[PDB]
Design a protein around this ligand. Structure first.
Ligand SMILES: Nc1nc2c(ncn2[C@@H]2O[C@H](COP(=O)(O)OP(=O)(O)OP(=O)(O)O)[C@@H](O)[C@H]2O)c(=O)[nH]1
Ligand SMILES: [Mg+2]
Lengths: 165, 194
C-alpha cells in the first residue's frame, strides 16, 4: 500500500479525480475543508490516496501530510490562466520539502476537454517542470469529467513506482 | 441518496446483534415513507434532511466489527461535511448541549486506547476534523475539547505513524480554526457595542 497526496489549488478537480479513480464515475463535490482519504486499486496496486482542500487559507497545512509520501498527484486547472503562477510557486515550495525528496511527481493538466485549455507543453513550461532537479516526473492532459487521460497517467505512475533502489 | 445504499450495506455484515439490525430497518422504512451516485447528496430542503434518522449509526460506532465502525465514521464525516446534519435541541439527554455534541461524543467514543482498530482510528481523526471545521455547525466548547482530546489521544497512543502525523495535522488545523472563530466573535463584540 502506497501513499499519494492529491494537491493543487481550490477548484482544480482533485476530489473529482479521487472518486473517478476509486469508483470509476464523476460525482458532485464541495470544497474539501479538512480532508478525504480513500483507498484506490489500479492495475492491481493498492493506494491510500488523500485529497486535501486547495482553498487559499488551507494550503499551509499541506506540508503536515508530506510524511512518507510515495507520489504527489498535482492537479492544475489548465483553464485557470490567472493563478497558474500560484500553481508554480506553490509547487516550487512543496518540492523543497525534505519529506518529498524521494517522491514521484505526476502533473495533471486537468480540464483538457475545455476549449480554453492551455497546451500540455505551455503548462509544463509555466510550472518550470523542465527546471526540476532530481524529480522523476511527467505531465498529463486530463479530463476527470469525461474520463480522458486518467488511465494513461495512472499507468505511468504505476510503472514509475515499480522502480526500487 | 447515499443514505439508502449505506443502510442496506449496514444490514449485511452481521445479525448476531439483532437490535442493531432492527434499528437500521426502521430508519430505512421511515426514509421510504418520507420519500412517498453512492456518496451523499446536496444540502437543499427537497432532500429530506436526515436528523433523528441518526440512531442506527450510534449502533454502528458501538458495534464491534471494526470494519463497520470504520464505515460509520466515514459516512458521518461525509454528510456532516455536506451540511446534512445541522443538529437540534437536546435529545434523550440534559440540555446545555445540542444533538451535534452527542454525535461528536459518540465518534470520540470509538477510540479507547492503542488496542482499537487503526482504520477506525483514522476515520475518527477525519470525522473529528470536518466536524470541528464544518462551516455549517457551531460546537459547545466542551465538545470541542473532547474532540481535541480524542485526537491528541490517538496521536500519543497510536502505533501507526500515518495516523500519528495526520492526528498531529488535524490537531493543528482544528485548534487554528476554532481559535480564529473565537477571535472574530470577540471582535464583533468589541464593535457591536460601538
Ligand atoms: N470541464 C471540466 N470540468 C471539471 C474537470 N474536472 C473537474 N471539473 C469541475 O470543476 C470542479 C472542480 O472541483 P473539485 O473536484 O472539488 O476540485 P478540488 O481541487 O477537489 O477543490 P477543493 O477540494 O476545494 O480544492 C468540479 O465541480 C467539476 O465539476 C474536467 O476535467 N473538465
Ligand atoms: Mg474538493
Amino acid at each position: 500500500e502506497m501513499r499519494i497526496l492529491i494537491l493543487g489549488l481550490d477548484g482544480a478537480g482533485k476530489t473529482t479525480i479521487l472518486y473517478r479513480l476509486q469508483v470509476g464515475e464523476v460525482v458532485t463535490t464541495i470544497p474539501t475543508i479538512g480532508f478525504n482519504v480513500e483507498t484506490v486499486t489500479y492495475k492491481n496496486l493498492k493506494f491510500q490516496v488523500w485529497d486535501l482542500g486547495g482553498l487559499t487559507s488551507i494550503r499551509p497545512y499541506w506540508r503536515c501530510y508530506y510524511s512518507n509520501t510515495d507520489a504527489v498527484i498535482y492537479v492544475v486547472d489548465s483553464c485557470d490562466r490567472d493563478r497558474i503562477g500560484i500553481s508554480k510557486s506553490e509547487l516550487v515550495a512543496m518540492l523543497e520539502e525534505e519529506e518529498l525528496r524521494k517522491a514521484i511527481l505526476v502533473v495533471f493538466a486537468n480540464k483538457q476537454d475545455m476549449e480554453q485549455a492551455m497546451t500540455s507543453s505551455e503548462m509544463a513550461n509555466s510550472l518550470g517542470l523542465p527546471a526540476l532537479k532530481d524529480r522523476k516526473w511527467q505531465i498529463f492532459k486530463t479530463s476527470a469529467t469525461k474520463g480522458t487521460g486518467l488511465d494513461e497517467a495512472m499507468e505511468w505512475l504505476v510503472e514509475t513506482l515499480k522502480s526500487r533502489q | 441518496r447515499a443514505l439508502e445504499k449505506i443502510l442496506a450495506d449496514k444490514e449485511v455484515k452481521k445479525a448476531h446483534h439483532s437490535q442493531l439490525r432492527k434499528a437500521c430497518e426502521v430508519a430505512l422504512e421511515e426514509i421510504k415513507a418520507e420519500t412517498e451516485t453512492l456518496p451523499p447528496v446536496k444540502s437543499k430542503t427537497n432532500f429530506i434532511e436526515a436528523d433523528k434518522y441518526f440512531l442506527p449509526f450510534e449502533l454502528a460506532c458501538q458495534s464491534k466489527c471494526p470494519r463497520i465502525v470504520s464505515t460509520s465514521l466515514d459516512c458521518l464525516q461525509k454528510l456532516i461535511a455536506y451540511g446534512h446534519l445541522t443538529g437540534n435541541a437536546p435529545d434523550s439527554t440534559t440540555p446545555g448541549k445540542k444533538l451535534i455534541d452527542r454525535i461528536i461524543e459518540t465518534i470520540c467514543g470509538c477510540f479507547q486506547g492503542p488496542q482499537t482498530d487503526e482504520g477506525v482510528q483514522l476515520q475518527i481523526i477525519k470525522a473529528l476534523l470536518t466536524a470541528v471545521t464544518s462551516q455549517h455547525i457551531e460546537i459547545h466548547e466542551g465538545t470541542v475539547l473532547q474532540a481535541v482530546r480524542t485526537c491528541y489521544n490517538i496521536y500519543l497512543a497510536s502505533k501507526n505513524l500515518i495516523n500519528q502525523t495526520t492526528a498531529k495535522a488535524t490537531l493543528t488545523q482544528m485548534l487554528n480554526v476554532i481559535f480564529a472563530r473565537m477571535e472574530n466573535q470577540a471582535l464583533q463584540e468589541a464593535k457591536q457595542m460601538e
